[PDB]
Amino acid sequence: GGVHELSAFEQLVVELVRHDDSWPFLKLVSKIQVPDYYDIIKKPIALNIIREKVNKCEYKLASEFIDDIELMFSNCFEYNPRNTSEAKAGTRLQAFFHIQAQKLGLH
């Protein structure tokens, strides 16, 4: 495995997808299941979208990549109250994100 400019970004996305608590985040929610989601969440995003932005070389700075992941968490907590399985999973995954990002040199 070689070392490349986007290796850290790609690695973090892979680590998040593989974590058990990533299920609320893999793809955007369906408007069929959640009719009011897109009237509430102004800038929807998910791990599939973020992965593709990494693949398509769309991030110029680590801060832009980090901001997209923070947006993903922000939307989740905005729509899902603290007592939901989504928010509980999101809380753990967000900690994992901070810890793993640090290890990869992303601040």
Numbering used by the authors: 1430 to 1536
Share the article's original sentences.
Here, we use CRISPR-Cas9-mediated and lentiviral-mediated genome editing to reveal that the non-catalytic subunits BAZ1A and BAZ1B are key for recovery after DNA damage in human cells, in part by recruiting the ATPase SMARCA5 to damaged chromatin. Moreover, we report the crystal structure of BAZ1A-BD, and we discover the ability of BAZ1A-PHD to bind DNA. Our study reveals that the PHD and BD domains of BAZ1A each support BAZ1A cellular function through the non-canonical biochemical features discovered here.
The C-terminal regions of BAZ1A and BAZ1B each contain one BD of unknown function. Both BAZ1A-BD and BAZ1B-BD bear a conserved asparagine “anchor” residue that, in functional BDs, hydrogen bonds with the carbonyl group of a bound acyl-lysine ligand and is required for this interaction. However, the BAZ1A-BD gatekeeper is a non-canonical glutamic acid. We confirmed that this non-canonical feature is compatible with the BD fold by solving the crystal structure of BAZ1A-BD to 1.7 Å resolution. We could not detect BAZ1A-BD binding to any of the peptides on the array. To test whether the glutamic acid gatekeeper inhibits the binding of BAZ1A-BD to acetylated peptides, we replaced it with a valine like in BAZ1B-BD. Unlike the wild-type domain, BAZ1A-BDE1515V showed substantial binding to the array that was dependent on peptide acetylation. To test whether the weak binding of wild-type BAZ1A-BD to acetylated peptides was mediated by the canonical BD pocket, we replaced the asparagine anchor with a tyrosine residue (N1509Y; BDNY) to completely abrogate acetyl-lysine recognition. We conclude that, while the BDs of BAZ1A and BAZ1B are both compatible with canonical BD function, the presence of a glutamic acid at the gatekeeper position substantially lowers the binding affinity of BAZ1A-BD to acetylated histone peptides. Together, the data suggest that BAZ1A-BD has evolved to bind acetylated histones with a specific affinity, and either increasing or decreasing the affinity of this interaction prevents BAZ1A from functioning in DNA damage recovery.
